[PDB]
């Protein structure tokens, strides 16, 4: 598959077994913190409804996304193996139009 600025993480959680309030905000912060070791994030969306446990990410550049996908794919997260896969830029922008103009690097919500 061809590398792009965007990718999807899968198997990050099971929404049916997530009971704690603001659990998706904690997942978001886990992804931002981990991608700061690479090139950062400009857009993130935690899918609270798919059983697959999907997280959508947009990096500031294709190089930043390659660094993040290579480092995150096949990792353990909360005792489960996660998959990282590229998302074509028109597919990502159709899902998240507000990500088209995103430029600012995201900061985690928690300390």
């Amino acid at each position: 598959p061809l590398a792009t600025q965007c990718f999807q993480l899968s198997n990050m959680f099971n929404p049916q077994t997530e009971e704690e309030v603001g659990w998706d905000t904690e997942i978001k912060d886990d992804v931002i913190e981990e991608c700061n070791k690479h090139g950062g994030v400009i857009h993130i969306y935690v899918d609270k409804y798919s059983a697959q446990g999907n997280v959508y990410v947009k990096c500031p550049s294709i190089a930043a996304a390659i660094a993040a996908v290579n480092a995150l794919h096949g990792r353990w997260f909360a005792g489960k193996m996660i998959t990282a896969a590229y998302v074509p830029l028109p597919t990502y922008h159709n899902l998240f139009p507000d990500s088209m103009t995103a430029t600012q690097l995201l900061v985690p919500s928690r300390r």
């Binding site: 904690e26 886990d30 981990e34 990792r75 353990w76 997260f77």
Partner: peptide, 9 residues
């Protein structure tokens, strides 16, 4: 909080 690189129990 530790979830990254945590293998199954």
């Amino acid at each position: 909080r530790k979830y990254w690189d945590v293998p199954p129990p």
